[PDB]
Amino acid sequence: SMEQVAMELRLTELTRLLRSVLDQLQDKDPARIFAQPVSLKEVPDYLDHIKHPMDFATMRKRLEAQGYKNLHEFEEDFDLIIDNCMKYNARDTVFYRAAVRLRDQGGVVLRQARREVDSIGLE
Ligand SMILES: O=C1Cc2cc(O)ccc2N1
Question: How far is the CA of 62 from the centre of ligand 1 (A)?
Answer without folding.
Answer: 23
